Amino acid sequence: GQIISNINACVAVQEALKPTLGPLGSDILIVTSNQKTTISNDGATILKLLDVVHPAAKTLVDISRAQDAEVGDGTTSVTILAGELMKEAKPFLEEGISSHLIMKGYRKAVSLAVEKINELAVDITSEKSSGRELLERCARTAMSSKLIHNNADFFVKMCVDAVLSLDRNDLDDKLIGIKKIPGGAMEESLFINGVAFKKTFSYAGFEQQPKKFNNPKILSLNVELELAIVDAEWQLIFEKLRQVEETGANIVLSKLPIGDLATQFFADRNIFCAGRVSADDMNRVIQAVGGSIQSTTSDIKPEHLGTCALFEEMQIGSERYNLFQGCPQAKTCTLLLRGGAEQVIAEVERSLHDAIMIVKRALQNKLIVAGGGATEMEVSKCLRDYSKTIAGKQQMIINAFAKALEVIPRQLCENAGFDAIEILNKLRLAHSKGEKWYGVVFETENIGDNFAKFVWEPALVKINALNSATEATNLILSVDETITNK
């Protein structure tokens, strides 16, 4: 009885995300105390800023935060399944059926579900689609399943070429970080092969900065340069500038800002320098240029100075930023977002970061199955025939989970404006007499084959979806009481 009151409060969680399922889904507006406007489809940022009342709401948050490691995308079609399993289980909990039979029967259904998902996943390899194909043709609609509907054609010819430079067995997520550049266009974004960061501070020689370097060398120094007492303070800073020139570093990255004495000495010799360097940008250079950070001038040596192919000063959005190109070791390609709207920059920021997860799991194993919610329909069709002979009461228990997967096609018809009953009758014959691969087609507004539609989705998303919804739904049934002090 105490769990039922906890479920009803958690039902409204995915019922607010109810329209968000599918590429036609909507977004949720969140305004915090700082008046920060956040518009995104991903529920991870939604549940993070969502006010929680009962501790059961935090359960879906912990799974959503861990969803980035397991899958990272399709969170609208996953978290909603955790509330649907407990929605249809209410009549069973009111009867003499214990929640243990629901939890024990759930693992028996997932064990049969994952067995069929691995059966649906087929790896041909051989002469079929290879690199630059599976990541383009089959990943066209797979990368972004929710947003970027109009700009999808732009990123397939751009973002796919950026993730192609990432070799298997490495999968570095530290070098894929993006930046926020106001103004410009989305399809006009320039590809960056090296470390690029903002200046964050204006110089008097901002227009006089060197345009480009033939053989630049980046050196990271934490020494703070700031100005009998006058002659002593000016001489000590001057001696530190001469020791840096001995190494022959054309680019010097300083953590703390520098005064006019260090700027004038570097400007006359055409030596580049940048202040207010963040600690996160220093680790990015170590994995790209391969230099080192020297705290003082005692241990500085010429071999600690790295180098890169060439340097270029880029001017975009009425502001100039540092641009590195031709780094010795680069596992990815830096992308710089553009556009005048801040929400759009943050909108595609969550989408592009979710697209790299597909490239990560594809390099390990290349597999595709029928998308568009047709995966649960074939699994639910097989569970109806098996559960009849499986352990007594488990027939009606698994059939409840079989009908719980029917929420996915009902949600796809809600946004598209279709009928929830009409799609079930057409798929029931399509997943029985129509074998398997026949899915639903939104473009032609009818039922068709996803094999000829070119739309596929990785089956690894559905594998971790049941595991992420396993401990999430089991924790609700395993907790029969909630106590809040004061």
Partner: protein, 454 residues
Amino acid sequence: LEAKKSHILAARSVASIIKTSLGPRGLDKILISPDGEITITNDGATILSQMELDNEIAKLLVQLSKSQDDEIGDGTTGVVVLASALLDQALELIQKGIHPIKIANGFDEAAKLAISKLEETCDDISASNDELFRDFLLRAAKTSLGSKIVSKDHDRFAEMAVEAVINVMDKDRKDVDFDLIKMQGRVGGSISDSKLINGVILDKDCVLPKEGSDGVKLAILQDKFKEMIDDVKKAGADVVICQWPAVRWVGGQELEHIAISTNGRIVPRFQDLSKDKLGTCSRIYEMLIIEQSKETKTVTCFVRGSNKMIVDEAERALHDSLCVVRNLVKDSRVVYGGGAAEVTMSLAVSEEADKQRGIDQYAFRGFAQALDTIPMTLAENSGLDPIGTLSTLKSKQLKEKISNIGVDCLGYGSNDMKELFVVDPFIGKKQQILLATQLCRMILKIDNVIISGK
């Protein structure tokens, strides 16, 4: 659908606030600052940015106009009107059972047709000589940029600002400088007392020129007082500005325009004073007036006025002309707006609706109807019937091949924009349409607004 219905009605109420301010003739409204100060200005971007409403739907339009102010700066009212017009048509098409993305897909396809149609109407003003080209830049601010009263003849203080960006920019017709172009105001006198010189005039504290040097020997920087003079006598500098002749309590950022124009540098300490930092300044005389007769990109327009809002509104009109002139120089595509291109692009989209038919016919009609809201709004602000105004424009553009016929707000007689010298940036109308539709797609995706607890 019921939640977004109230958001569209709330967005239309926001557009109705600035509805009377659309166009150069557009009338403003009194805005009261939260501190009690009254703000009266004819710029639509200034009132809308400073105004803050309750509902979050109005705050979403503030971020849309925030990017329009930093880019365009003049005529930002048409951005909200066009965005609200797309939402006004959403009360019908979405109610018909069509998904917003299906309607949103027709807006992006119709936007490419409007951009392609607008490109065919581009008229290059740089094809003539420099005499007619520089005259078009001055006449560009004569009509389109004129808004407030007394601006009837503004060319006294306007020509100083128009010729300011001309001498800075190279004759190759491609340049951008946002560093050295700034406005310096003064409270007093009249707007007609402005002057055009090369330099900067501050509020803080003469000598004859020399032969070899460019004169005044400008150097940017009782026993100790005379000891520093001996170091000046080594360089022979006649006028020296001492931060840390002499000045008292001057700022470092204010002296940056002096060191850049004179090729000088900031001297941290008197021990670091050297001759290599000696600059060149033509004349310095008293409030000292700094002038430079050599070639430099530093130009500051000294402006006077009896009130703060008089100087502030005058500078914002002249400062926003930097992006206007840059689009008339660096950008070779110049189009004639003010009811000309808006109605012309609407007729091309209306013909595309009947070609595709299907569900895009009503989608393309909503985009053409949205562009028709600008001339209907200008008609009410000009005192003309909206139906009779659009019926006249469409009748002439179909019978005659001239696409420059547009709405006449101020009673200029003939509606030809080419004879009236009404020019609008080509990139301006492109960014206003795309960014407006960019937000309208996010408005239709609003489901439930989550607000933190008070």
